[PDB]
Amino acid sequence: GMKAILQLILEKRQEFEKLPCFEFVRDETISPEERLILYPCIAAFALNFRDLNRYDYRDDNSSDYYQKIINIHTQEDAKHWEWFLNDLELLGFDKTMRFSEALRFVWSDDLLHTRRLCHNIAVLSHDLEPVMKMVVIEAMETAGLVIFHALAKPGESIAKATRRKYLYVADSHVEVETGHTILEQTQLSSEQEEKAKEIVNKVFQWSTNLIGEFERYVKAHRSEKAQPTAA
Amino acid sequence: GMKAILQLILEKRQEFEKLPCFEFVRDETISPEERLILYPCIAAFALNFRDLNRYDYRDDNSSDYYQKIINIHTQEDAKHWEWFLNDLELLGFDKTMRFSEALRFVWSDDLLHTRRLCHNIAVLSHDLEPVMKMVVIEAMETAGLVIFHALAKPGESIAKATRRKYLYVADSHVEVETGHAEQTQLSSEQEEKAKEIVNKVFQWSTNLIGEFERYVKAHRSEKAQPTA
Numbered sequence: 001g002m003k004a005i006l007q008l009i010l011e012k013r014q015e016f017e018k019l020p021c022f023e024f025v026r027d028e029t030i031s032p033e034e035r036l037i038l039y040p041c042i043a044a045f046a047l048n049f050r051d052l053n054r055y056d057y058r059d060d061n062s063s064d065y066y067q068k069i070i071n072i073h074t075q076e077d078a079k080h081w082e083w084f085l086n087d088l089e090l091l092g093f094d095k096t097m098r099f100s101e102a103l104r105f106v107w108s109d110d111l112l113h114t115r116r117l118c119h120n121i122a123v124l125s126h127d128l129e130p131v132m133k134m135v136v137i138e139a140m141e142t143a144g145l146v147i148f149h150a151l152a153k154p155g156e157s158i159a160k161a162t163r164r165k166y167l168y169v170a171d172s173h174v175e176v177e178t179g180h181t182i183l184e185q186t187q188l189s190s191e192q193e194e195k196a197k198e199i200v201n202k203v204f205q206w207s208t209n210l211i212g213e214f215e216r217y218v219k220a221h222r223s224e225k226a227q228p229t230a231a
Numbered sequence: 232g233m234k235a236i237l238q239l240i241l242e243k244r245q246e247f248e249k250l251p252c253f254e255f256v257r258d259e260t261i262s263p264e265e266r267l268i269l270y271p272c273i274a275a276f277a278l279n280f281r282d283l284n285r286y287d288y289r290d291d292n293s294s295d296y297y298q299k300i301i302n303i304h305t306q307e308d309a310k311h312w313e314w315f316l317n318d319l320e321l322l323g324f325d326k327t328m329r330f331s332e333a334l335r336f337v338w339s340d341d342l343l344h345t346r347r348l349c350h351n352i353a354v355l356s357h358d359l360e361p362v363m364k365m366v367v368i369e370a371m372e373t374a375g376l377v378i379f380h381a382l383a384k385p386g387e388s389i390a391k392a393t394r395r396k397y398l399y400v401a402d403s404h405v406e407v408e409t410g411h412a413e414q415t416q417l418s419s420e421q422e423e424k425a426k427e428i429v430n431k432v433f434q435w436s437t438n439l440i441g442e443f444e445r446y447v448k449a450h451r452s453e454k455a456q457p458t459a
């Protein structure tokens with residue numbers, strides 16, 4: 001019943017792992033600077049995700065024991081945007097630009113699905129019982145681990161070659177997200193099972209659409225390789 | 232019924248019009264450059280609002296009378312973000328910064344209610360039938376009109392003085408929003424939901440104006456720098 005759900009996520013993860021974008025990010029025959037062309041795209045997601053954790057997932061005024069554990073989970077994930085901004089700078093992507101060019105970049109029509117992923121999760125999850133909220137978090141954290149397992153490859157390559165401490169496209173981020181059960185010990189209704197199926201499918205479809213935009217961005221911006229600096 | 236709902240919107244607008252922010256923005260004893268220091272704050276709202284119209288409010292495959300009305304409405308409101316970026320440039324607020332400084336500005340804790348107003352409206356409206364979305368939209372458009380009625384006062388003073396065409400903090404924008412800001416029978420359940428909708432929209436709009444007020448106080452020297 002719930003075994004079915006944890007199992008649908010593993011099936012979804014194994015499909016997600018095979019997307020062309022990940023084959024590209026893992027390709028060691030391509031400079032890591034070329035593979036991380038997609039890095040600024042994450043700007044449309046990373047601060048929205050911080051806010052999802054802080055304001056949508058987290059509920060400080062709850063006694064329910066499942067919301068209590070969600071709150072602890074959300075507090076750790078709400079710190080990773082700063083790591084994003086750390087590696088933005090190291091990769092040479094923290095460029096000077098007009099305020100309006102920064103805005104037109106984030107709200108690019110080419111980053112629609114990247115930008116609205118967190119919005120879609122909030123609308124999905126706003127009227128969910130805490131145990132259905134945990135499924136959302138679990139599916140989203142599974143998609144996240146796949147993406148960062150991949151990006152930490154070019155990332156750790158640049159970190160060692162330049163001798164700099166990367167925090168976002170880094171083993172240390174993967175390790176914390178590995179660190180990220182009670183869902184084993186939980187029983188779902190037929191209703192709660194059908195809902196959880198709908199959730200897992202939507203999260204993996206929305207993450208697939210975001211990865212699709214990263215792949216299109218690399219192909220559109222082939223010249224704009226990372227420009228990291230050595231020590 | 233629907234009658235009292237429009238009366239509530241009217242009462243909330245009369246309340247909203249008299250916030251300190253708007254007394255400040257309307258104060259012709261202060262330079263219009265100072266009355267527009269809130270302007271860059273709208274960056275957290277204007278592009279979100281574009282996306283609310285394009286992606287949340289709009290549903291092209293609908294025969295529902297009210298949704299067809301909403302579709303036409305949303306198509307106009309979804310163009311106003313370019314006007315925002317036009318006047319950002321004219322006001323001297325389109326400055327060169329690090330990408331990260333732009334992100335930290337928009338995702339400022341000081342602009343939380345500004346940034347999430349559209350998110351709150353999306354969450355509130357996502358399950359509503361089109362007649363009830365119309366209530367959400369009328370409330371929001373009414374609050375919009377109050378704000379732009381105020382901002383166009385220093386806006387047009389700067390446009391005339393500099394001989395440049397302002398599009399956002401300008402009478403031409405107010406003219407569109409005047410058009411935007413019917414008689415239906417609502418279940419008692421709907422009348423109740425509609426009253427909750429009007430109360431929430433004017434509360435979240437009041438919170439946003441609150442942040443503009445705080446920003447102006449904290450950045451009181453950062454006046455607009457238009458050129459003639």
Ligand SMILES: N[C@@H](Cc1c[nH]c2c(Br)cc(Br)cc12)C(=O)O
Binds near residue numbers: 147207
């Ligand atoms: N560990 C990520 C969270 C994450 C979780 N899910 C993600 C997806 Br789907 C796409 C992207 Br890009 C990022 C995530 C973070 O720290 O921002």
Ligand SMILES: N[C@@H](Cc1c[nH]c2c(Br)cc(Br)cc12)C(=O)O
Binds near residue numbers: 280371372378436439
């Ligand atoms: N006429 C506005 C729409 C709008 C409608 N409601 C608004 C509120 Br509440 C605050 C702010 Br700032 C803007 C609005 C626009 O074109 O961006």
Ligand SMILES: [Fe+2]
Binds near residue numbers: 077080173177
């Ligand atoms: Fe993370």
Ligand SMILES: [Fe+2]
Binds near residue numbers: 308311375404408
């Ligand atoms: Fe407008």
Ligand SMILES: [Fe+2]
Binds near residue numbers: 307372407408411
């Ligand atoms: Fe409008």
Ligand code: NI
Binds near residue numbers: 123126127357358
């Ligand atoms: Ni809902």
